[PDB]
Amino acid sequence: NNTIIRFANSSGGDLEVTTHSFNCGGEFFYCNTSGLFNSTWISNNDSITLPCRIKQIINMWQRIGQCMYAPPIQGVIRCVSNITGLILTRDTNSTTETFRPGGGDMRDNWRSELYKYKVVKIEPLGVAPTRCKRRV
Amino acid sequence: VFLGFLGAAGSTMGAASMTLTVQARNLLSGIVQLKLTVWGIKQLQARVLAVERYLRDQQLLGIWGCSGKLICCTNVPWNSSWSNRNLSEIWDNMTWLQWDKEISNYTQIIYGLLEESQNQQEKNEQDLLALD
Amino acid sequence: CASDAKAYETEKHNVWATHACVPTDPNPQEIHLENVTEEFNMWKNNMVEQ
Amino acid sequence: KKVVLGKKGDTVELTCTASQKKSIQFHWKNSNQIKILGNQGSFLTKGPSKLNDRADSRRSLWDQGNFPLIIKNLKIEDSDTYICEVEDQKEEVQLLVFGLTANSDTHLLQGQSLTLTLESPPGSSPSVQCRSPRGKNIQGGKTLSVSQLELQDSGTWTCTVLQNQKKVEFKIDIVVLAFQKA
Numbered sequence: 001n002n003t004i005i006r007f008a009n010s011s012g013g014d015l016e017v018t019t020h021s022f023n024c025g026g027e028f029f030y031c032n033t034s035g036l037f038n039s040t041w042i043s044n045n046d047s048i049t050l051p052c053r054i055k056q057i058i059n060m061w062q063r064i065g066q067c068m069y070a071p072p073i074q075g076v077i078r079c080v081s082n083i084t085g086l087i088l089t090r091d092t093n094s095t096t097e098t099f100r101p102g103g104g105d106m107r108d109n110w111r112s113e114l115y116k117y118k119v120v121k122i123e124p125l126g127v128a129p130t131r132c133k134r135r136v
Numbered sequence: 137v138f139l140g141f142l143g144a145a146g147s148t149m150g151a152a153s154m155t156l157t158v159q160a161r162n163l164l165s166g167i168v169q170l171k172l173t174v175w176g177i178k179q180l181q182a183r184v185l186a187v188e189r190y191l192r193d194q195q196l197l198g199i200w201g202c203s204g205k206l207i208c209c210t211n212v213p214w215n216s217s218w219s220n221r222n223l224s225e226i227w228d229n230m231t232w233l234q235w236d237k238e239i240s241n242y243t244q245i246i247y248g249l250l251e252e253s254q255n256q257q258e259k260n261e262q263d264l265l266a267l268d
Numbered sequence: 269c270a271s272d273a274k275a276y277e278t279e280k281h282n283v284w285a286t287h288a289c290v291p292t293d294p295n296p297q298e299i300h301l302e303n304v305t306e307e308f309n310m311w312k313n314n315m316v317e318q
Numbered sequence: 319k320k321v322v323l324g325k326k327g328d329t330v331e332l333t334c335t336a337s338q339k340k341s342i343q344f345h346w347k348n349s350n351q352i353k354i355l356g357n358q359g360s361f362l363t364k365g366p367s368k369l370n371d372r373a374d375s376r377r378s379l380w381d382q383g384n385f386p387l388i389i390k391n392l393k394i395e396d397s398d399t400y401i402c403e404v405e406d407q408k409e410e411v412q413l414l415v416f417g418l419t420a421n422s423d424t425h426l427l428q429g430q431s432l433t434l435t436l437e438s439p440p441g442s443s444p445s446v447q448c449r450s451p452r453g454k455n456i457q458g459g460k461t462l463s464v465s466q467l468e469l470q471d472s473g474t475w476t477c478t479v480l481q482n483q484k485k486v487e488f489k490i491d492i493v494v495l496a497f498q499k500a
Contacts, residue, residue, distance in 0.1 A: 011364060013364060017363075061359065061360075062359040062361055064381070104359045104361040106359070145304075146301055176288075279338060280339075
């Protein structure tokens, strides 16, 4: 109840982890989320425009050794989605704590949902002590 | 005494009958535990053939009113033409393999009466006993 | 099939041509059969062909 | 307890190897648990260490189960113990970075002195031996000094630093002007 929370962009590096990769009608977008992740909180319209880039060659699940060319789409595109969750990564460590987004492993998107579920194996057969002597 | 799978195979039919279950278990066995691939449809085929192999004869025992198998009696008398030997000449002095060597000649013939006679007559009869 | 149990530990992205194969039992069983005798014919043994 | 000797301004490759030839999660840290570098799936991450701008891996070896820490433009203060964490297991390597400089960058005269100074990390006590073109040998620890240079000392000197049974080799070019007759 006495710490400081700061938000910043990623550490750069690869364009896939740096910018925001998401699907949108066959086209692949890479957006500079610096416009979102730039804030701070103390101790205790309006609207935002996010610049994006387009790419025809991309690598899914980070599987090197292969590629995929997405065909262009004719006409204007305007997908719509809703941000339901985030993927933050916790970064002179007693008050201020900077945070930035992350990704890379796509299993995070599936776990983020499947946590509500688990699978178990039923064992139909059991035994127990009972007052009973079986006759012929 | 536990002998093991087919552990009584080398004994008289009387003796062997002691431990039929030790064999019975592994007649179906169970357990066992890039696509296709060699073995990919072979383990498949084999494991299937095991199931069929089993039930094909099990159903016959279902028809031959016993079910509680390994051993059961019938109401079909033994025809003397089917290898006329004495019980001590058979049960106390012959293995199952040696037995089949002879009796195999009348397999389907015996099955005829087993498949039928009793199964037919045991019933009807009962329905008639249910009259009152 | 059936090919040992430690051979798979070598891995090397499949050695020779065995990985897709059931591990062997740690105690392979046997039993000598007394009074049991019969013919052996290696020249018609179709195990070879397979 | 692996030991690797580096040269100041050179590159070094610290190795890490998994049991299997596939890309898995790895991470390099130093002795204070500061993250250097690792992967997230196929992607490289770099941690908030002082090595950040000079650290890399070789991702073309990750599918082979090799996850090296490459450090370029080595600094003396890069000397540390580094730990690769891979498959619930830790691989430890001590890096020691050395530098060796002549006190003069300019041409020397016959009869003049030459002093080599070994830059070394805190807590290291290396031995040094250097040999001139003519076979003149000098040994020491921190500083090695030849009182009087001969014309025949002109050229490439070869210096070996010994530390932790390991050695690293420096070549230093010495230029001096001398008469070709007595």
